[PDB]
Design a protein around this ligand. Structure first.
Ligand code: CU
Ligand code: CU
Length: 440
């Protein structure tokens, strides 16, 4: 009712249970004024938003109707790696039911996508992704309850012949970016705000594109990172979202008008072709061109809410028991990517850690591109990047490292089992940059 805004269909838990059969299938769809056949969950792009409360049971049956094997990664959920199993393969025509309980203190925006090694990048690029929202008691305080809430799934695409464009040799090296920069599967939609305070859940579900988000004439007030709430709102003029990262921001519309949400130029170190330059840039691709993501129309006579004074206190973490060093390196021309000089081998365990202990991980980017590092199953606290302090305390599961940057992460090891860590430029993961952690 009122103005429409494109947003994925929401499926909600009922009486503590979210039970849902989701098919992964090729699907003809309308997209940016054309018809295209994508790979989708539940017949839509993006897939449906699953919305649960803490302590809910999730029983998701994935029915594989693709021509190739697949599986699901529950990105950012601290659940068992025997449920969130990166090594599982669901053959075409077969089904698999994922059953888990939502942890009691969890809150924020998460997502699901394929994680069959070697096929992630084509499958994710083809449209297989969806959001998972864990509601929190904090959503009831007036300063958030009365905000207008929307999910914004940021995902670019490129089509050729009415299907997702194939990966080129350059895509395996740089990660694939597409010419259609979409919001919730729509091109430059318009959001007609009905409240003066907005609460926007942001999800970068792109293969490799970075979104340096800025809203004309407005700061953003960050209230949640990947894995949960900040301790209090943080005002920012702009917000860089790397592939796989999520944020929740409050927007306070002061005046009437139409304001662009843009992805400002960002240079993530991608490499260009043909060596024959004059002066300007050369063969580094250089900064991305700016993109308009959506248009925001403020309500008449807008009066925003006061910001919440506080959000969620961040638990103090015990002293770490071990320090780890993970060096990321690249061989760009072979498009091969390494952690500590090795490529992923599913038969090899790279790190052995103890359940119920805290570790510090020093992840060092000795490449020339940004690499966004992701750890399954165990959310972490970023303490510092490049020797300087992180700007807030919150659970993260992806941390962006620019060339030469070293991140120090506090990693509480929860669930026992074998899981992975990898770059979330998913082409790099497919081409080597993944390793295996075993918790016992
Ligand atoms: Cu992910
Ligand atoms: Cu990478």
């Amino acid at each position: 009712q009122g103005p429409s805004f494109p947003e994925p269909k929401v499926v909600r838990s009922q009486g503590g249970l979210l039970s849902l059969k989701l098919s992964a299938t090729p699907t003809p769809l309308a997209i940016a004024g054309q018809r295209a056949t994508l790979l989708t969950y539940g017949g839509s792009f993006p897939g449906p938003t699953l919305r649960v409360r803490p302590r809910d049971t999730v029983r998701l049956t994935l029915e594989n109707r693709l021509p190739e094997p697949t599986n699901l990664h529950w990105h950012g959920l601290p659940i068992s790696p025997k449920v969130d199993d990166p090594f599982l393969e669901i053959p075409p025509g077969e089904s698999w039911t994922y059953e888990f309980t939502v942890p009691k203190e969890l809150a924020g925006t998460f997502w699901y996508h394929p994680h069959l090694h070697g096929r992630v990048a084509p499958q994710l690029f083809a449209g297989l992704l969806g959001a998972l929202v864990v509601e929190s008691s904090l959503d009831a305080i007036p300063e958030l309850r009365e905000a207008e809430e929307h999910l914004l799934v940021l995902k670019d695409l490129a089509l050729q012949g009415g299907r997702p464009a194939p990966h080129t040799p350059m895509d395996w090296m740089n990660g694939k970016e597409g010419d259609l920069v979409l919001v919730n599967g729509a091109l430059r939609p318009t959001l007609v705000a009905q409240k003066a305070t907005l609460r926007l859940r942001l999800l970068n579900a792109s293969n490799a594109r970075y979104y340096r988000l800025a809203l004309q004439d407005h700061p953003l007030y960050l209230i949640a990172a990947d894995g949960g709430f900040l301790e209090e709102p943080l005002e920012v003029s702009e917000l860089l979202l790397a592939p796989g990262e999520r944020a929740e921001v409050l927007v306070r519309l002061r005046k009437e008008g139409r304001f662009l949400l843009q992805a400002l130029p960002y240079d993530r170190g991608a490499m260009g072709m043909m060596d024959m330059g004059g002066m300007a840039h050369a063969m580094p691709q250089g900064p991305s061109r700016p993109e308009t993501l959506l248009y925001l129309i403020a309500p008449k006579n807008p009066k925003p809410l006061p910001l919440p004074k506080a959000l969620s206190p961040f638990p103090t973490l015990p002293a770490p028991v071990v320090t780890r060093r993970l060096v990321l390196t690249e061989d760009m021309m072979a498009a091969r990517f390494f952690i500590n000089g090795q490529v992923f081998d599913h038969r090899r365990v790279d790190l052995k850690g103890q359940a119920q202990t805290v570790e510090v991980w020093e992840v060092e980017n000795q490449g020339d591109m940004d690499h966004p590092f992701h750890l399954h199953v165990h959310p972490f606290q970023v303490l510092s990047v490049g020797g300087r302090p992180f700007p807030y305390r919150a659970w993260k599961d992806v941390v962006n490292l620019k060339a030469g940057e070293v991140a120090r992460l506090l990693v509480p090891l929860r669930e026992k089992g074998r899981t992975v860590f990898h770059c979330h430029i998913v082409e790099h993961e497919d081409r080597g940059m993944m390793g295996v952690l075993e918790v016992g």
